[PDB]
Scaffold this active site. Structure first.
Site: not given
Length: 129
Positions: A35, A46, A48, A50, A52, A59
């Protein structure tokens, strides 16, 4: 902060993640690795809209508020910046909440695709825990 492998595992154990919800310590370290590459300051956007945040790439859609995520819950009650700190306390506490919301460590798609089912104890190998 960019943690060492065993350095992260120790701090994660100390904070109660070893077999938290059944996941051995190596599952958390493996998650961190792919990650964030053990970097507390990692951020990623991301699709969408958003982002992380942090060692465990938590997120803004559900977990934290970064002030630029619409339709966003802040279920961990933290600004997302708290998750970039050299102090993992808030990441580790938010993880505990995420990992308990139904789908376990499958919430971290990297874990599912990269860690789930693998020799995860290798990540806590050689370490003075």
């Amino acid at each position: 902060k960019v943690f060492g492998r065993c350095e992260l595992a120790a701090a994660m154990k100390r904070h109660g993640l070893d077999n938290y919800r059944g996941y051995s310590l190596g599952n958390w370290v493996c998650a961190a690795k792919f990650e964030s590459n053990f970097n507390t300051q990692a951020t990623n956007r991301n699709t969408d809209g958003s982002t992380d945040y942090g060692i465990l790439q938590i997120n803004s859609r559900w977990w934290c508020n970064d002030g630029r995520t619409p339709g966003s819950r802040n279920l961990c009650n933290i600004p997302c910046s708290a998750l970039l700190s050299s102090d993992i306390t808030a990441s580790v506490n938010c993880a505990k909440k995420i990992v308990s919301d139904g789908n376990g460590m499958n919430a971290w798609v990297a874990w599912r695709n990269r860690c789930k089912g693998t020799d995860v104890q290798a990540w806590i190998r050689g370490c003075r825990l």
